[PDB]
Amino acid sequence: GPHSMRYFETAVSRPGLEEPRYISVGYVDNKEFVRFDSDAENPRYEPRAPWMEQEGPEYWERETQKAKGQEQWFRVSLRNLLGYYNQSAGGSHTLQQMSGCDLGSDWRLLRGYLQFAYEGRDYIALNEDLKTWTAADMAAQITRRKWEQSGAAEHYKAYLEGECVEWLHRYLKNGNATLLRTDSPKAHVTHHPRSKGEVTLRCWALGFYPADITLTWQLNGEELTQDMELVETRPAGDGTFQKWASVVVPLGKEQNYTCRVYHEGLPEPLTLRWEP
Amino acid sequence: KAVANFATM
């Protein structure tokens, strides 16, 4: 199947004496696998998935040195941006980066990503050609010209087509068992008189992994598309997730309605109803 | 392994 790797990096400047805080998080198939945080007593890249314990001390030492470089890069970049936008000192500012690759099951690079945001707004991005830049505003035009003049895109292209792909392959090989694990939802329906002769039926799904899930309500064999309220899928805090979906129905008709739960972990979708 | 950025912004 398809696979992805991403590194999500954040530098945040602080008005006081302190240098910017720098955090980098690595993900494989959307699962956090390494993290570096300049605020730790011993800042270093740390494994965040059990399958990363295979890497030797030199992996961690050299990645840590890389992070240290990135941290200086972001400090300089933040200073430059403050000048581009004519911002006053003694504020706080956020620079973010996302980088990585999506691969097919034949290990072909499908797309490479390299993009930045400043103050939560898109700043500059490497286009899908891995050769040209899209710059969002006036300041980013300065950065784009600078990067075109130094031939920056070819270094990012080499990373995205080379190292990104090859390391992703290594990680997927090492983390195979673990990355395929699933926990199935347990589901049940609750009944809540809100009223004017109406009831809310709420269909709960609990304890499931990964977070991807679909809950639907139906009446007489049609899904209820518009009428249904949802909550965003939320972490239980033990590694599993939770979600619910509810419909408003007439009192006396509750038994007509069925909730369905679709999840990768299940041998088939669940189907359930208010059981008084 | 992580990207190593080149020229600063």
Epitope: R62, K66, G69, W73, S150, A158 | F6, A7
Partner: T-cell receptor, first 110, second 112 residues
Framework: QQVRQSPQSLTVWEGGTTVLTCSYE??????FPWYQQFPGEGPALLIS?????DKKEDGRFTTFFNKREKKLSLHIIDSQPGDSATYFC??????????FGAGTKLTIKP | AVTQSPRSKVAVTGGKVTLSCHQT?????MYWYRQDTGHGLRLIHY???????EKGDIPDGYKASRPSQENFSLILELASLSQTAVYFC????????????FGAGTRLSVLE
Amino acid sequence: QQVRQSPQSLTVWEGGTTVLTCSYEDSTFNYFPWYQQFPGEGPALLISILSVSDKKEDGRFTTFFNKREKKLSLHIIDSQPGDSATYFCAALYGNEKITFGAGTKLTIKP
Amino acid sequence: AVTQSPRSKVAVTGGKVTLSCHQTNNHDYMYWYRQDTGHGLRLIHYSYVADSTEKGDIPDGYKASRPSQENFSLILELASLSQTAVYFCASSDAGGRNTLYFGAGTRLSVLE
């Protein structure tokens, strides 16, 4: 040490092709710049190549990279008196600090 | 530009020597290298920000100072004979793969 550059000096006849070579130890190195230094001046970047490529050409200068043998080379065709200089190969990985070779002193004589 | 001062220095053994470098590249990284009879660029010290410095490969006998973004000095508190060499300053953006821009060198002779 990590970048081995030999010999210390080399003379090639004017018009001939100069071949300079270096080897490296760390197989993860992936950026390879050559610096050229004239007498009484500092080194200046001549040509560079990433490990994704086999060669890079710029005028009479070509650098070749061979990952399998961990060898870098610089070729100068139609070698001229103005090419007389010290050539440094260098290598690094990622954003780590550059490692320079010891330099080869080139003299083009008629 | 990266410009070093002085161009040449003759000093007594045990005497104090300061080599200066001024860069107008708006670069953040600065470096001091040693070259010996035309060979090597061996890193002595470097710096990535005003007010601090970092040891290079061969820091023994030398100190470094970074009093501003533009200036980076190399200090020999007690010059020895063995420090007779040519010294080159450089700057770069953010180090790593960023091109190094060098000064034209300072020749130092240390004599009894």
